[PDB]
């Protein structure tokens, strides 16, 4: 990888396009057959509410998994960072 | 392709989000080892100048090339529509 180098890169950039990203802080993934199945840590402003990190968590999800058409899993949380 | 489809539907993403375009009237894509070339018409105003066609064409290359990595050659022409 080679590969996932390239879907890694996407990946991080699709998410740090999300609005209240604060950074991928860590991101695994790993090939199921052709599928990718993903898991990521985005940091967040430590002053937002649980309910709106779910929210980013899910916003990027939603970002990600629409950019990427291969990936089959996402798991994202978040953690406070700045 | 299979492979080229979700290039394909990357390419026209990516260009059809550049001010100015259009649509995507025409997409040729042939891989040439692991790498894409590729020949892309796209619809501008009518009413746009010369000058003002050549410049969408040229952040449409910018746009499409910085988003596809795979992509080491592409043409871009303009034709007017609606
Ligand atoms: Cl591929």
């Not at 996932?4 to 057959?33: D, F, K, S, T």
């Not at 967040?44 to 980013?56: G, L, M, R, S």
Request: net charge negative; glycine share 8%; charged share 30%.
């Amino acid at each position: 990888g080679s590969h996932m180098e390239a879907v890694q890169n996407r990946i991080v950039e699709a998410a740090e396009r999300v609005p209240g990203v604060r950074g991928v802080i860590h991101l695994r993934a790993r090939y199921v057959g052709q599928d990718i199945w993903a898991d990521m840590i985005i940091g967040v402003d430590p002053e937002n509410t649980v309910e709106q990190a779910e929210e980013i968590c899910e916003a990027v999800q939603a970002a990600v998994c629409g950019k990427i058409r291969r990936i089959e899993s996402l798991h994202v949380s978040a953690e406070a960072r700045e």
